[PDB]
Coordinates of all heavy atoms in Angstrom, one line a residue:
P31 N -19.0 -5.9 -10.6 CA -17.9 -6.4 -9.7 C -16.5 -6.0 -10.2 O -16.3 -6.0 -11.4 CB -18.1 -7.9 -9.6 CG -18.8 -8.2 -10.8 CD -19.6 -7.1 -11.2
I32 N -15.6 -5.6 -9.2 CA -14.2 -5.3 -9.6 C -13.3 -6.3 -8.7 O -12.8 -6.0 -7.7 CB -13.9 -3.8 -9.6 CG1 -14.2 -3.1 -8.4 CG2 -14.4 -3.2 -10.9 CD1 -13.8 -1.6 -8.3
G33 N -13.2 -7.4 -9.4 CA -12.6 -8.7 -8.9 C -11.2 -8.9 -8.5 O -10.2 -8.9 -9.3
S34 N -11.1 -9.4 -7.2 CA -9.9 -9.7 -6.5 C -10.3 -10.4 -5.1 O -11.0 -11.4 -5.2 CB -8.9 -8.5 -6.3 OG -8.1 -8.4 -7.4
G35 N -9.9 -9.8 -4.0 CA -10.2 -10.3 -2.7 C -9.1 -9.8 -1.7 O -8.5 -8.8 -1.9
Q37 N -8.8 -7.9 0.5 CA -9.3 -6.5 0.8 C -9.8 -5.8 -0.5 O -8.9 -5.3 -1.2 CB -8.2 -5.7 1.6 CG -8.1 -5.9 3.1 CD -9.3 -5.6 3.9 OE1 -10.2 -6.4 4.1 NE2 -9.4 -4.4 4.4
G38 N -11.1 -5.9 -0.8 CA -12.2 -6.5 -0.1 C -13.4 -6.8 -0.9 O -13.2 -7.3 -2.0
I39 N -14.6 -6.5 -0.4 CA -15.9 -6.7 -1.1 C -16.1 -5.4 -1.8 O -16.7 -4.4 -1.3 CB -16.9 -7.1 0.0 CG1 -16.5 -8.3 0.8 CG2 -18.3 -7.1 -0.4 CD1 -16.6 -9.7 0.1
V40 N -15.6 -5.2 -3.0 CA -15.6 -4.0 -3.8 C -16.3 -4.2 -5.2 O -16.1 -5.2 -5.8 CB -14.2 -3.4 -4.0 CG1 -14.3 -1.9 -4.5 CG2 -13.4 -3.5 -2.7
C41 N -17.0 -3.2 -5.6 CA -17.6 -3.1 -6.9 C -17.6 -1.7 -7.5 O -17.3 -0.8 -6.8 CB -19.1 -3.6 -6.9 SG -20.3 -2.4 -6.3
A42 N -17.8 -1.6 -8.8 CA -17.9 -0.3 -9.5 C -19.3 0.1 -9.7 O -20.2 -0.7 -9.9 CB -17.1 -0.4 -10.8
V52 N -17.8 5.6 -9.6 CA -17.3 5.5 -8.2 C -17.0 4.0 -7.9 O -17.4 3.1 -8.7 CB -18.4 6.1 -7.3 CG1 -18.1 6.0 -5.8 CG2 -18.9 7.4 -7.8
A53 N -16.3 3.7 -6.8 CA -16.0 2.4 -6.3 C -16.7 2.3 -4.9 O -16.4 3.2 -4.1 CB -14.5 2.2 -6.2
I54 N -17.5 1.3 -4.7 CA -18.2 1.1 -3.4 C -17.6 -0.2 -2.8 O -17.7 -1.3 -3.3 CB -19.7 1.0 -3.6 CG1 -20.3 2.3 -4.2 CG2 -20.3 0.7 -2.2 CD1 -21.7 2.2 -4.6
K55 N -17.1 0.0 -1.6 CA -16.5 -1.1 -0.8 C -17.4 -1.3 0.4 O -17.7 -0.4 1.2 CB -15.1 -0.8 -0.3 CG -14.5 -1.9 0.6 CD -13.2 -1.3 1.3 CE -12.5 -2.4 2.1 NZ -11.2 -1.8 2.6
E73 N -9.3 3.1 9.1 CA -9.5 3.4 7.7 C -10.5 4.4 7.4 O -10.3 5.3 6.6 CB -9.8 2.1 6.9 CG -10.2 2.2 5.5 CD -10.3 0.9 4.7 OE1 -11.4 0.3 4.6 OE2 -9.2 0.6 4.1
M77 N -9.2 8.0 5.9 CA -9.8 8.3 4.6 C -10.5 9.6 4.6 O -10.5 10.4 3.6 CB -10.7 7.2 4.0 CG -9.9 6.3 3.0 SD -11.0 5.0 2.2 CE -11.6 6.0 0.9
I86 N -6.3 7.6 -1.8 CA -7.7 7.4 -2.1 C -8.6 8.3 -1.1 O -8.4 8.2 0.1 CB -8.1 5.9 -2.3 CG1 -9.4 5.8 -3.1 CG2 -8.2 5.2 -0.9 CD1 -9.3 5.7 -4.6
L106 N -18.1 2.3 2.0 CA -17.2 3.4 1.7 C -17.3 3.6 0.1 O -17.1 2.7 -0.6 CB -15.8 3.1 2.1 CG -15.6 2.6 3.5 CD1 -14.2 2.1 3.7 CD2 -15.9 3.6 4.6
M108 N -15.7 5.7 -2.9 CA -14.5 6.4 -3.3 C -14.4 6.5 -4.8 O -15.3 6.0 -5.5 CB -13.2 5.7 -2.7 CG -13.0 4.3 -3.2 SD -12.2 3.3 -1.9 CE -13.6 2.5 -1.2
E109 N -13.5 7.3 -5.4 CA -13.2 7.5 -6.8 C -12.9 6.2 -7.5 O -12.2 5.4 -6.9 CB -12.1 8.6 -7.0 CG -12.1 9.2 -8.4 CD -10.8 10.0 -8.7 OE1 -9.9 9.9 -8.0 OE2 -10.8 10.6 -9.8
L110 N -13.4 6.0 -8.7 CA -13.1 4.7 -9.4 C -11.8 4.9 -10.1 O -11.7 5.8 -11.0 CB -14.3 4.3 -10.3 CG -14.2 2.9 -10.9 CD1 -14.1 1.8 -9.9 CD2 -15.3 2.7 -11.9
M111 N -10.9 4.0 -9.9 CA -9.6 3.9 -10.6 C -9.7 2.8 -11.6 O -10.5 1.9 -11.5 CB -8.4 3.8 -9.6 CG -8.4 4.8 -8.6 SD -8.0 6.5 -9.1 CE -6.3 6.3 -9.3
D112 N -8.9 2.9 -12.7 CA -9.0 2.0 -13.8 C -8.4 0.6 -13.5 O -9.0 -0.4 -13.9 CB -8.4 2.6 -15.1 CG -9.2 3.8 -15.4 OD1 -10.5 3.8 -15.3 OD2 -8.6 4.9 -15.7
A113 N -7.2 0.6 -12.9 CA -6.5 -0.7 -12.7 C -5.8 -0.7 -11.3 O -5.5 0.4 -10.8 CB -5.6 -1.0 -13.8
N114 N -5.4 -1.8 -10.9 CA -4.6 -2.1 -9.7 C -3.2 -2.1 -10.1 O -2.9 -2.5 -11.2 CB -5.1 -3.4 -9.1 CG -4.5 -3.7 -7.7 OD1 -3.4 -4.1 -7.6 ND2 -5.3 -3.5 -6.7
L115 N -2.2 -1.8 -9.2 CA -0.8 -1.8 -9.6 C -0.4 -3.2 -10.0 O 0.5 -3.3 -10.8 CB 0.0 -1.2 -8.4 CG 1.4 -0.8 -8.8 CD1 1.5 -0.1 -10.2 CD2 2.0 0.1 -7.7
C116 N -1.0 -4.3 -9.5 CA -0.7 -5.7 -9.8 C -0.9 -6.0 -11.3 O -0.2 -6.9 -11.8 CB -1.6 -6.6 -9.0 SG -0.6 -8.1 -9.1
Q117 N -1.7 -5.2 -12.0 CA -1.8 -5.4 -13.5 C -0.9 -4.5 -14.2 O -0.3 -4.9 -15.2 CB -3.3 -5.2 -13.9 CG -4.3 -5.0 -12.8 CD -5.7 -4.7 -13.2 OE1 -6.6 -4.2 -12.5 NE2 -6.1 -5.0 -14.5
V118 N -0.8 -3.2 -13.8 CA 0.1 -2.2 -14.4 C 1.6 -2.6 -14.3 O 2.3 -2.5 -15.2 CB -0.2 -0.8 -13.7 CG1 1.0 0.2 -13.9 CG2 -1.5 -0.2 -14.3
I119 N 1.9 -3.2 -13.1 CA 3.3 -3.7 -12.9 C 3.7 -4.7 -14.0 O 4.9 -4.8 -14.2 CB 3.3 -4.3 -11.4 CG1 4.6 -4.3 -10.8 CG2 2.7 -5.8 -11.4 CD1 4.5 -4.4 -9.3
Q120 N 2.8 -5.4 -14.6 CA 3.0 -6.5 -15.6 C 3.2 -5.9 -17.0 O 3.4 -6.7 -18.0 CB 1.9 -7.5 -15.6 CG 1.8 -8.3 -14.3 CD 0.5 -9.1 -14.4 OE1 -0.5 -8.7 -14.0 NE2 0.7 -10.4 -14.9
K153 N 1.9 -2.8 -0.8 CA 2.0 -3.8 -1.9 C 1.2 -3.4 -3.1 O 0.3 -2.6 -3.0 CB 1.5 -5.2 -1.3 CG 0.1 -5.2 -0.7 CD -0.4 -6.5 -0.2 CE -0.2 -6.7 1.3 NZ -1.3 -6.1 2.0
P154 N 1.5 -4.0 -4.3 CA 0.8 -3.6 -5.5 C -0.7 -3.7 -5.4 O -1.3 -2.8 -6.0 CB 1.4 -4.6 -6.5 CG 2.7 -5.0 -6.1 CD 2.6 -5.0 -4.6
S155 N -1.3 -4.7 -4.7 CA -2.7 -4.8 -4.6 C -3.4 -3.6 -3.7 O -4.5 -3.4 -3.9 CB -3.1 -6.2 -4.0 OG -2.7 -6.2 -2.6
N156 N -2.6 -3.0 -2.9 CA -3.0 -1.8 -2.1 C -2.9 -0.5 -2.8 O -3.0 0.6 -2.3 CB -2.0 -1.7 -0.8 CG -2.4 -2.6 0.3 OD1 -3.5 -3.1 0.5 ND2 -1.4 -2.7 1.3
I157 N -2.6 -0.5 -4.1 CA -2.4 0.7 -5.0 C -3.1 0.5 -6.3 O -3.1 -0.5 -6.9 CB -0.9 0.9 -5.2 CG1 -0.1 1.0 -3.9 CG2 -0.6 2.1 -6.1 CD1 1.4 0.7 -4.0
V158 N -3.8 1.6 -6.6 CA -4.6 1.7 -7.8 C -4.2 2.9 -8.7 O -3.5 3.8 -8.2 CB -6.1 1.9 -7.4 CG1 -6.7 0.6 -7.0 CG2 -6.3 3.0 -6.4
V159 N -4.4 2.7 -10.0 CA -4.0 3.7 -11.0 C -5.1 4.0 -12.0 O -6.1 3.3 -12.1 CB -2.6 3.3 -11.8 CG1 -1.5 2.9 -10.8 CG2 -2.9 2.3 -12.8
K166 N -2.9 6.2 -6.7 CA -3.4 6.4 -5.3 C -3.2 5.2 -4.4 O -3.5 4.0 -4.9 CB -4.9 6.8 -5.4 CG -5.1 8.2 -5.9 CD -6.6 8.5 -6.2 CE -6.8 9.8 -6.9 NZ -6.6 11.0 -6.0
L168 N -4.5 2.8 -1.5 CA -5.8 2.5 -1.0 C -5.9 2.4 0.6 O -6.9 2.9 1.1 CB -6.3 1.1 -1.5 CG -6.6 1.0 -3.0 CD1 -6.8 -0.5 -3.4 CD2 -7.9 1.8 -3.3
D169 N -4.9 1.7 1.1 CA -4.7 1.3 2.5 C -3.8 2.3 3.4 O -3.2 3.3 2.8 CB -3.9 0.0 2.4 CG -4.2 -1.1 3.5 OD1 -5.4 -1.2 3.8 OD2 -3.2 -1.8 3.8
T188 N 0.0 -11.9 1.3 CA 1.1 -11.6 0.4 C 2.1 -10.8 1.2 O 1.8 -9.7 1.7 CB 0.6 -10.8 -0.9 OG1 -0.1 -11.8 -1.7 CG2 1.7 -10.3 -1.7
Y190 N 5.6 -10.8 0.3 CA 6.8 -10.6 -0.6 C 7.4 -9.1 -0.6 O 8.5 -8.9 -1.1 CB 6.4 -10.9 -2.0 CG 5.7 -12.2 -2.2 CD1 4.5 -12.3 -3.0 CD2 6.2 -13.4 -1.7 CE1 3.9 -13.6 -3.2 CE2 5.6 -14.6 -1.9 CZ 4.4 -14.7 -2.6 OH 3.8 -15.9 -2.8
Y191 N 6.6 -8.1 0.0 CA 7.0 -6.7 0.0 C 7.3 -6.2 1.4 O 7.7 -5.0 1.5 CB 5.8 -5.9 -0.6 CG 5.4 -6.5 -1.9 CD1 4.3 -7.4 -2.0 CD2 6.1 -6.2 -3.1 CE1 4.0 -8.0 -3.2 CE2 5.7 -6.8 -4.3 CZ 4.7 -7.7 -4.4 OH 4.4 -8.3 -5.6
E217 N 10.1 -5.3 -9.4 CA 9.1 -6.1 -10.0 C 8.6 -5.5 -11.4 O 8.4 -6.2 -12.3 CB 7.9 -6.4 -9.1 CG 7.0 -7.5 -9.5 CD 5.8 -7.8 -8.6 OE1 6.1 -7.8 -7.4 OE2 4.7 -8.1 -9.1
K222 N 8.5 -10.1 -12.6 CA 8.5 -11.3 -11.7 C 8.8 -10.8 -10.3 O 9.5 -9.9 -10.1 CB 9.7 -12.3 -12.1
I223 N 8.0 -11.4 -9.3 CA 8.2 -11.0 -7.9 C 9.6 -11.3 -7.5 O 10.2 -12.3 -7.7 CB 7.1 -11.8 -7.1 CG1 5.7 -11.5 -7.5 CG2 7.3 -11.6 -5.5 CD1 4.7 -12.6 -7.2
Ligands
0F0_1 C1 -1.2 -9.6 -8.4 C2 -2.6 -9.5 -8.0 C3 -3.5 -9.2 -9.2 O1 -3.0 -9.4 -10.4 N1 -4.7 -8.8 -9.0 C4 -5.5 -8.3 -10.1 C5 -5.4 -8.7 -11.4 C6 -6.2 -8.1 -12.4 C7 -7.2 -7.2 -12.0 C8 -7.4 -6.9 -10.7 C9 -8.4 -5.9 -10.3 O2 -9.6 -6.0 -10.7 N2 -8.1 -4.9 -9.4 C10 -8.7 -3.7 -9.5 C11 -8.7 -2.9 -8.3 C12 -9.2 -1.7 -8.3 C13 -9.8 -1.1 -9.4 N3 -10.3 0.3 -9.3 C14 -10.5 0.8 -8.0 N4 -10.8 2.1 -7.8 C15 -11.0 2.6 -6.6 C16 -11.0 1.7 -5.5 C17 -10.7 0.4 -5.7 C18 -10.6 -0.6 -4.5 C19 -10.8 -0.1 -3.3 C20 -10.6 -1.1 -2.2 C21 -10.3 -2.4 -2.5 N5 -10.1 -2.8 -3.8 C22 -10.2 -1.9 -4.8 N6 -10.5 -0.1 -6.9 C23 -9.7 -1.8 -10.6 C24 -9.2 -3.1 -10.7 C25 -6.5 -7.4 -9.7 C26 -0.4 -10.0 -7.1 N7 1.0 -9.5 -7.2 C27 1.3 -8.8 -5.9 C28 1.9 -10.6 -7.4

Side-chain angles (χ1 to χ4, degrees), residues 31-35 37-42 52-55 73 77 86 106 108-120 153-159 166 168-169 188 190-191 217 223:
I32 52 173
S34 275
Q37 277 300 87
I39 302 289
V40 195
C41 83
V52 175
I54 301 167
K55 180 194 184 171
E73 174 167 88
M77 262 184 84
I86 199 87
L106 314 169
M108 62 214 98
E109 197 191 10
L110 188 61
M111 305 291 282
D112 298 318
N114 188 281
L115 201 37
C116 204
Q117 356 174 195
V118 159
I119 209 158
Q120 294 175 273
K153 56 179 100 77
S155 69
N156 277 343
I157 303 154
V158 285
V159 310
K166 288 172 188 286
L168 291 170
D169 214 40
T188 288
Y190 311 134
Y191 309 95
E217 198 176 317
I223 300 159

